[PDB]
Design a protein around this ligand. Sequence first.
Ligand SMILES: Nc1nc2c(ncn2[C@@H]2O[C@H](COP(=O)(O)OP(=O)(O)OP(=O)(O)O)[C@@H](O)[C@H]2O)c(=O)[nH]1
Ligand SMILES: Nc1ncnc2c1ncn2[C@@H]1O[C@H](COP(=O)(O)OP(=O)(O)NP(=O)(O)O)[C@@H](O)[C@H]1O
Ligand SMILES: COc1cc2c(c(OC)c1OC)-c1ccc(OC)c(=O)cc1[C@@H](NC(=O)CS)CC2
Ligand SMILES: Nc1nc2c(ncn2[C@@H]2O[C@H](COP(=O)(O)OP(=O)(O)O)[C@@H](O)[C@H]2O)c(=O)[nH]1
Ligand SMILES: [Mg+2]
Ligand SMILES: [Mg+2]
Lengths: 421, 301, 419
Amino acid sequence: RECISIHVGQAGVQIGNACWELYCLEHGIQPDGQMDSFNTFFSETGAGKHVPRAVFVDLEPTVIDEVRTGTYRQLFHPEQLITGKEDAANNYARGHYTIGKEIIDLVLDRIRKLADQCTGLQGFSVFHSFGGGTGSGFTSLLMERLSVDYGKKSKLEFSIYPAPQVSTAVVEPYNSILTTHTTLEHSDCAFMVDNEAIYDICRRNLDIERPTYTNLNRLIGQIVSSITASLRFDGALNVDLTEFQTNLVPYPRIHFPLATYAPVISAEQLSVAEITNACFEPANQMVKCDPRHGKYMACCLLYRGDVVPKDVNAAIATIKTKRTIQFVDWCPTGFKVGINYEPPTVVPGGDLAKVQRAVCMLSNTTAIAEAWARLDHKFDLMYAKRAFVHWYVGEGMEEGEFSEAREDMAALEKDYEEVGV
Amino acid sequence: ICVCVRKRPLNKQELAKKEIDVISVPSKCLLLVHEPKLKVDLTKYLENQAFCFDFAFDETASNEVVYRFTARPLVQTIFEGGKATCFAYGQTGSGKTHTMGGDLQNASKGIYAMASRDVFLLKNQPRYRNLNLEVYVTFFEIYNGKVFDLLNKKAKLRVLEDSRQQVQVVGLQEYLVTCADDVIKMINMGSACRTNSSRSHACFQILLRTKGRLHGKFSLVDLAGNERMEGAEINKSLLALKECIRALGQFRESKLTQVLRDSFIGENSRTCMIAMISPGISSCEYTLNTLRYADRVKELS
Amino acid sequence: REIVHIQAGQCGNQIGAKFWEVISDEHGIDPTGSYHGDSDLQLERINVYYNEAAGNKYVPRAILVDLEPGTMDSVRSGPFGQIFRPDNFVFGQSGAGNNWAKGHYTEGAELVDSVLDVVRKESESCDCLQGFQLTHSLGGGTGSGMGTLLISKIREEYPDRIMNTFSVVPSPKVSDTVVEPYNATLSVHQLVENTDETYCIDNEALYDICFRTLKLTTPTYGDLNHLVSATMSGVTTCLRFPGQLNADLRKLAVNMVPFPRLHFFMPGFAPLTSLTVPELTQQMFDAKNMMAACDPRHGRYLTVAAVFRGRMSMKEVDEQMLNVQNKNSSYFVEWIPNNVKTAVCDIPPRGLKMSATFIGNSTAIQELFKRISEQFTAMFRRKAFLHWYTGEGMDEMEFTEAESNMNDLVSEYQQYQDA
Ligand SMILES: Nc1nc2c(ncn2[C@@H]2O[C@H](COP(=O)(O)OP(=O)(O)OP(=O)(O)O)[C@@H](O)[C@H]2O)c(=O)[nH]1
Ligand SMILES: Nc1ncnc2c1ncn2[C@@H]1O[C@H](COP(=O)(O)OP(=O)(O)NP(=O)(O)O)[C@@H](O)[C@H]1O
Ligand SMILES: COc1cc2c(c(OC)c1OC)-c1ccc(OC)c(=O)cc1[C@@H](NC(=O)CS)CC2
Ligand SMILES: Nc1nc2c(ncn2[C@@H]2O[C@H](COP(=O)(O)OP(=O)(O)O)[C@@H](O)[C@H]2O)c(=O)[nH]1
Ligand SMILES: [Mg+2]
Ligand SMILES: [Mg+2]
């Protein structure tokens, strides 16, 4: 039925800022206010306005302040925008303990103020950074507590895996490992987004020498749109969360599906068979790695626009003939195909053009663990000397919690590899 | 698989009604049925039929003698870690309960008791002492596809079977016994609240356990008469039993065969079938039916 | 002597709706009105499928069940929407399911009584009740889960009379849910225990017939239902029509099912899509023409029952019908004597000048059970989407208990390819 969006911390906020704008454009809601189906994400407030079911939280104003500034200012309620004066400082230990504690009760209560006008809520979609102050810290704490106040209700996280070039912070790897540990036993399914992969797609495709955040976010916007879409329009693909995940995660170990967007092509018609063909192409992923190496244990195809199954079929047939199928031992050959006739609308001054048809493909491969390694190594190697640990012990964390968390990442990397044939 | 037949003597009622005894057992493996017949012209004659079994017992054979050549040789099987089953099969009033449970009443004089007696004797033998086993007993009856714990006041139990297919009887009560007198107390208790007369399947079990694991198990079964349409469940179980036993030396399931499934699937499993026969001329058709069923069972050996 | 018809869950409702409007025009019945058509027969046994009310009117003895309005109002504002008795519809309102559990325990039980209490009215109204027949799907849940429940509760109130079902067994192609195998297996078990005869309409078979042999590209749920709907009229003909047999439906049972375990029939139809006789038999006995994904070759027939249709000479039929179990005389179990019976009726179906239909209790059906048990143990392996049921109240071992019962059914059918 219903569906709350939560955006915590800079990356979280800005990403959502850009996909709540693609949402509006998709459903045609003039910023100001007005124009079920569209109801999954909005609450028809007042006798005009349309307003989102979202909450934005950051531990410094800055980011949120620009939201209450640029158009869309009217779009939200003043309450759904929570801000916190003192910064997260860039260390989980602060976001999860010291500085968080102070704002958790006020957020927690407001999101419940939102869930109250929702006859039979469904779950939360949460957007946050992997490394990064409050993105790691506060998130982790939110999720712990959301699990206390909302037993069943699923939690779908949209995480941003950090990458050297689209500037990180030295301590980033600590933060990532840290949150992903606590946060793991509390999420149902999470969508990782490698900032290197998106920086990468903006280069090979959009042809931008210096990709901005505002440039990256736009693209991510689209991937997210295509992911939710199904449950916004409505009678189409992955209906009512649950049957969304029941489709991708075979094991409680929160599995992170690998996302691949269809045709990304700059402004200023691609064949149904061709875009599917571009979906089994590493250069177009969302997490830098490669599944021609690992195995697949559940494939998903989410189309949008002008498409008849008649082709989608013949495109699959030929997509297996001269390709690396490599499906895993004990699991069918998935391919829950979903088509959503509603065409892919893109932002007006955007860098990508209108497209006749687009695909999405969400696969849960074992090769996604190649990213869990790339992070562990960084962490392991710094921790080898307590590199920056003292800043965390400083806010009140135990040196043990650092072990205890990497300890899980050692385990996860094992599980992932263990699923192989 | 071992198949035997036991003829019971004519009882008071039958002798009084002047019932003719039409059964002879001239040797330890041969049973003769002197079947009365009439030619078309009404002339009386005998079609004397012969059946051969591993062991054929006459009317003078006591329960101890019968026990010695049927269930006794199976006790060792459970100490060797196998699964043994002994079935008493035949018509209503043929001697099934008398043989397995005691004369009638007297538990000690029946196969359940005698088998228990030898289980305690063997466990104390050097070759088995070091096994450090504990002896457990169970007593349940199957009536219309339903299982009832006779040691837990006819409590109706549930029978489940995963996908791997082993069966489990949820709630069946296992009682620790350390003496034959113990076993005799559980047999009296169970027989006291059983649904004499058939209508059910009786099954008294002797289990051997050491450490969380089952070492061996012996299931002694007192079957329902082989001769209100519940006879359909009884006939299906008997048909199912036959195929399970034959499958041992090489469906259309029923409760009985579902519960005893694990005792026919293992490679280290033995079974003995004892066919009870009422010697009276009036029961000749029931006898032939019992004997032919028996023939097909041993046919797999 | 007289039968009531329960019809539940989106698929069932749609399937049966076509059945109804198909036999109704066979008998010559208006959306409400009565007879109209120069035929005279029809009305003899119209009794059997139609409790008749006020004035002329005919109103079918049908109960409509679902756990979400939509599908029902699809019928009402549809083909013969006006035909069914108003308070005979039983709405659900709440969440559907598409998860067995919900329909056989939580959201299911909720309704049961209000339906049971309406079947109870129809039944007790019957002059001499013959039994019930229900249509539903085995995959999904608002009819595969409430249905198997509805029937578990009909026996108990009606051990007496017999239970008949047309159940659509689902496939990997043309399916809405990843869970179907769970829903399927969970019902198959139930059917085995409380029904006398069950017809298997495999959707895999169904799709194959439309595209693999009918040039029909995208198979709607529409031209697909047209197959099932035509088949269902063929299968019942002898109980709704002449004065050749009469069909106690119990006679049909006692004669088609040699073994208790309710044996499942694979049906087959003669001409098709939306006919010499030798040409008709050759087709009606062809795998390429069965309603279940099987292939009687990889298995013998226990008993077969065939029913022709249209003005044709039985002299030829009895001749050709012998000529099949001759050129194929190895595939008819020889431990059951005259195990293949044929009935002829002379009132043509829709279009079709000639027609035939086929009912087969064949050990090849084993093939079908094996393939759903293949995706089941293939998912219940590393306990898949299972937490969706655990949650609605079910126990982990109630799955193994179903799986176990089901494989036996395979291990029994495979036991009877004996001698
Ligand atoms: N894709 C994307 N990544 C971002 C964006 N903004 C920051 N990041 C990334 O997010 C990570 C840092 O997270 P932050 O949002 O700055 O951390 P935060 O604590 O949540 O926010 P602050 O309180 O401002 O420190 C790094 O991986 C950055 O590359 C954005 O707008 N889009
Ligand atoms: N070998 C035997 N010697 C003396 N009496 C016997 C013998 N076998 C059976 N009887 C008696 O004959 C009757 C049959 O007993 P049991 O009670 O043994 O029958 P089933 O158990 O054969 N009958 P049922 O329960 O009806 O299927 C009882 O009264 C026994 O005491
Ligand atoms: C006083 O203002 C400064 C503040 C900071 C940084 C810095 O050095 C470039 C400054 O200039 C002197 C800074 C520093 C250090 C880092 O590691 C060496 C880092 O990763 C990152 C940074 C700066 N942040 C970033 O580059 C985020 S993408 C933020 C903290
Ligand atoms: N042929 C036939 N099969 C159907 C139809 N609708 C659904 N099915 C099949 O039946 C299964 C479940 O049907 P559904 O009606 O959605 O389940 P319900 O919630 O119990 O009503 C699906 O997996 C399909 O394979 C139908 O219209 N006709
Ligand atoms: Mg921060
Ligand atoms: Mg007895």
